[PDB]
Write a protein that binds this DNA or RNA. Structure first.
Ligand SMILES: [Ca+2]
Ligand SMILES: [Ca+2]
Ligand SMILES: [Ca+2]
Ligand SMILES: [Zn+2]
Ligand SMILES: [Zn+2]
Ligand SMILES: [Zn+2]
Ligand SMILES: [Zn+2]
Lengths: 478, 478
DNA sequence: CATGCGTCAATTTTACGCAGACTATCTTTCTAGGGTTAACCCTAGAAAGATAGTCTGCGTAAAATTGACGCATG
DNA sequence: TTACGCAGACTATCTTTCTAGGGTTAACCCTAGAAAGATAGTCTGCGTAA
């Protein structure tokens, strides 16, 4: 079955549809329905303007269009005071006013606030749980992974009393919400993933690394695929217990130097030359100890074919040569997200998560798109063009409806008319036949003394005219 | 002696003069002279046209204007492919062109290439010395420091081949060029500074920390001041050497652990209760050992005559409070430069220094500006308005020279004319020479490639049209 | 006052000629970002550097376009 | 008829919290400046007059 989009994802050449696969109707309807509860709750008697109206599904799509465009322009840390400034750009004011944008960001909700106070017992993630599960479900069901998978962590930076907040040194951002994730290697596709809550996490007799590899692997259990892991996810009993009737997955990965299972032989940094390696085995698994420059050693473990080899062009053991090519799956997805991200400063952790889901949906939709286009021998566009097209496909319906107000200021009326795709009625270029003059005649607005040959026929009334009097259109037809 | 700008730059009430104050004409003249040396060598006989013309002083000013505006916005890591995309913004296209900006950016030079090959043996930093020395000189003569000074280090982040860079783990942009500097605490004004060249710096029998404090202190060795710093710069003999006749400074700072000058009295014991402190004395100097909540100690040193008592709001000794409140003197210069800054990737090292100098000049110019306006009882504008005004005052003389060419593309002419202050007396919108441009030579709706002239316009929409389409009104007007 | 043709001369439109400044997109080369077995390694995507193409002004000579008179009966 | 007053939807700018960012004594601390939140306005098009 190789790898690529599934049957229900075939022949989609429209990046709006590739995006909707991850933001289904159920997700959009829940956001609009619950958001309106806050708009009603926070409305006061003096708040009677247009700015304080409820949310429509067209408007929720448009605000998402804005988030996609800020990611493209890399200006997500710029204030709304400047983003909506007409003297610098009209790209963000033709879609929404500055004030309604600020108002909606404060009001978005993903749950029923009247149920939540008891619904939350035993689940700290409750306020965003329905949307998260609807979203993850579409990752799992829309694509077939290849032979190599990899599992690693990703952080969503956040400060602001999040009950799941973790402090993690040796990161760009020290505080945030941790997410565990599984990706298709080579083609960086998110297959699965689960937030780490840590209160609201229960693994009975199971260390976290083992727990998450087994649960993330769910869709591929029994398929004979290979998973690449760093130290957090490589316990030996994981490597051995994934080769059973249930679970048929191999493990390739690093081992912490303090594991007792590594023979002391493979730790003797004093006798080994630089560039050399040692191999040993335990039942089905192969362990290799490689010694780079002095005072360092590398421990790699794997479930693999028995043959061992060294790539003579570098002198490194093949397990290292191989490891280095699959370990980057999750991280590569993370750096792609950092180049183009929708994240904004916010005061509520559940909003931070929406931004995270948008960043992922915009990448997974690109992967489905490039497979459907390149498989037909067509050229595939870069990410920048893909996202410019989402902007127009997500905001055009809304922009068009804004023109119905009698009062839009001309700044907006003109930019919406020009940016909005210019469909022009009549451009079918096939007219209806109506009688016309086929003989030589004179201008009816000219005196008989002139007998000016008519050289035109009125656009809206087919009158015989001279260009001097009635140029193309007749005066009465203007 | 007070604190604030000096007499020579006191009655300056605008941003352009405050900026020119730091760079001066000697720097602009040297850059233009040497830049032209490369333009004349990289130009081939097949490369003709406006894009390959030499550099004028007015264009180099426009060039700085673009970098400044780029710093106001956060978009300084955008490709030149879309910073100059007129469908998103008119900010940059109205000043130059995409291609001339790329050509000039790779051609700037700050020296005489025929002389340097015999200077470079000692002057490792040659290619920027005649720009750098003048800049520092100007900084020193324009501002009077206060009683509190802070000395610390900054990295520029450039990767590539150039013996100025050094690798520093546990830092963002870990591989760049290191610069040392001294700032006036409270205004965060830069007084002095100098690069670290790795080798050839000729510090002899003196650690770099002591060496640089002494050299950087020169411009302030008048009345006595207190200088503070972290561990890199706090050797005890520095503290004592700064109190000898030729020196005027006292020192307050942290102490690196395991130094021979610190007693076992302060280093010790597991039995010291948490939250307490202990003092030891040596002639003029006071040493304090403070043990915060985590129960690990911090060592501070002071050559000041300040009282050893505790600030009873925190329980911390006053000496600790002083350090925490003064150490940010350099760090926040970098925070300001982490928000609004010019930096671009490049393959050529000396540009890293050029961009650093622009960022510094903008901050110091703002400090002088704010002081001079508030001292008159007027309002001080925020840093963002200051920067927007530098863009407007720095590029306008250049833009007026683009509107000389009979063929400048008209969409630029329309934008240039409107975003430009009116310096011409006796004119008005209804009394102008502009309407000679009404007679656009070509048809709005015909391809420009056929050069089909238009002798008519659409009455209802006021657009220029050709008879082939329509004569009186355009096809869209009816 | 109103409509059916004919005779070419005047006016306007079209088709390119010169020139000038700016613009979209291609294929190498190699830094920015960040992780981590790593004072090493990978990936993505922007600068380097070049080519062919797009708008804007101005000029001239044909080609198609009127339009000012010759009727023509009523 | 020229040109005035009304309500709709959009906009600038102030004063209070309190997060992004970095550095380091630091699982803590400090800073600038954005978001939160509210109060005054601007600019468009639809009914009246001499
Ligand atoms: Ca706001
Ligand atoms: Ca370029
Ligand atoms: Ca420091
Ligand atoms: Zn006529
Ligand atoms: Zn008509
Ligand atoms: Zn035309
Ligand atoms: Zn028109």
């Amino acid at each position: 079955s190789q790898r690529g989009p599934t049957r229900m994802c075939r022949n989609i050449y429209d990046p709006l549809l590739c995006f909707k696969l991850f933001f289904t109707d159920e997700i959009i309807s829940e956001i609009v329905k619950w958001t309106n509860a806050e708009i009603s709750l926070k409305r006061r008697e003096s708040m009677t303007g247009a700015t304080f109206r409820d949310t429509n599904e067209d408007e929720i799509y448009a605000f998402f269009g804005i988030l996609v465009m800020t990611a493209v322009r890399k200006d997500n840390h710029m204030s709304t005071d400047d983003l909506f400034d007409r003297s610098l750009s009209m790209v963000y004011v033709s879609v929404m006013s500055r004030d309604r944008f600020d108002f909606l960001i404060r009001c978005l909700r993903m749950d029923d606030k009247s149920i939540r106070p008891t619904l939350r017992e035993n689940d700290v993630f409750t306020p965003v749980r329905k949307i998260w599960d609807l979203f993850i479900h579409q990752c799992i069901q829309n694509y077939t992974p290849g032979a190599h998978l990899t599992i690693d962590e990703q952080l969503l930076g956040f400060r602001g009393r999040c009950p799941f907040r973790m402090y993690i040194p040796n990161k760009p951002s020290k505080y945030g919400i941790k997410i565990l994730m599984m990706c298709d290697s080579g083609t960086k596709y998110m297959i699965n993933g689960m937030p780490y809550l840590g209160r609201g996490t229960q693994t009975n007799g199971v260390p976290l690394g083992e727990y998450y590899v087994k649960e993330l692997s769910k869709p591929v259990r029994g398929s004979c695929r290979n998973i690449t892991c760093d130290n957090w996810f490589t316990s030996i009993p994981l490597a051995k217990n994934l080769l059973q009737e249930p679970y048929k997955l191999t493990i390739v990965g690093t081992v912490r130097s303090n594991k007792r299972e590594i023979p002391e032989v493979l730790k003797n940094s004093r006798s080994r030359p630089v560039g050399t390696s040692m191999f040993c085995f335990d039942g089905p698994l192969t362990l290799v100890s490689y010694k780079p420059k002095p005072a360092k050693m590398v421990y790699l473990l794997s479930s693999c074919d028995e043959d061992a080899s060294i790539n003579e062009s570098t002198g490194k053991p093949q397990m290292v040569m191989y490891y280095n090519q699959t370990k980057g799956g999750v991280d590569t997805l993370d750096q792609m997200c950092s180049v183009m991200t929708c994240s904004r400063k916010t005061n509520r952790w559940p909003m931070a998560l929406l931004y995270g889901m948008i960043n992922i949906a915009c990448i997974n939709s690109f992967i489905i798109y490039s497979h459907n286009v390149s498989s037909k021998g067509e050229k595939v566009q870069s990410r920048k063009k893909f996202m410019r097209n989402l902007y127009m496909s997500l905001t055009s319906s809304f922009m068009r409806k804004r023109l119905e107000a009698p009062t839009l200021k001309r700044y907006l009326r003109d930019n919406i008319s020009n940016i909005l795709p210019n469909e022009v009625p009549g451009t079918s270029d096939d007219s209806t036949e109506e009688p016309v003059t086929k003989k030589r005649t004179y201008c009816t607005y000219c005196p008989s003394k002139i007998r000016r040959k008519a050289n035109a026929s009125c656009k809206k009334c087919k009158k015989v005219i001279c260009r001097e009097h009635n140029i193309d259109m007749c005066q009465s037809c203007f």
